[PDB]
Structure formats: C-alpha cells, structure tokens
C-alpha cells in the first residue's frame, strides 16, 4: 500500500496472522488494538531484523503510526 506495510504484513503475518483489514488505522499498533509487548515487539524484532537497522525501542513509537513508519523505513533503509 504505502511502503512498510510490505514488512509490516509479513511481520504480523508470521506472527499471528493477517490482520491488514483490522490493523491499519493509522492510529497505533500497541494502543489502537493494543495486541501485546510479546507479539508486537516480536514481529518488530523481524522487521528489523530482515532490513538490517539499528533500531531497537524507537520502533515502539515510529511504526505504531502509518505516517511514521513508511517515513521510518524511508529515512533509514531509504530503500
């Protein structure tokens, strides 16, 4: 859709499943749903983990928001 939605779904999408229609909100990603530390830390810890950061908590601010996440991989993958 946007840009980190790509790892993003396949992050979620190997954690627990697809909830693209239920998780895109633009709002948050542990408020709006407010999933669990364990499930959204763990398909974080893939996201980065696959694109080769140096992120480590700031992804618990950056991705919770469509705006700040595609703007996060841009910034720093830039790719």
Same mark, same amino acid.
């Given at each position: 859709?946007?840009?980190?939605?790509?790892?993003?779904?396949?992050?979620?999408?190997?954690?627990?499943?697809?909830?693209?229609?239920?998780?895109?909100?633009?709002?948050?990603?542990?408020? +709006?749903?407010? @999933?669990?530390?364990?499930?959204? !830390?763990?398909?974080?810890?893939?996201?980065? &983990? #696959?694109? *080769?950061?140096?992120?480590? +908590?700031?992804? @618990?601010?950056?991705?919770?928001? !469509?705006?700040?996440?595609?703007?996060?991989? &841009? #910034?720093? *993958?830039?790719?």
């Amino acid at each position: 859709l946007k840009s980190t939605f790509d790892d993003i779904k396949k992050i979620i999408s190997k954690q627990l499943s697809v909830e693209e229609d239920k998780i895109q909100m633009n709002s948050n990603f542990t408020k +709006d749903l407010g @999933a669990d530390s364990l499930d959204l !830390v763990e398909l974080i810890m893939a996201l980065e &983990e #696959k694109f *080769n950061v140096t992120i480590s +908590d700031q992804d @618990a601010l950056k991705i919770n928001t !469509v705006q700040d996440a595609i703007d996060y991989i &841009e #910034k720093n *993958n830039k790719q």
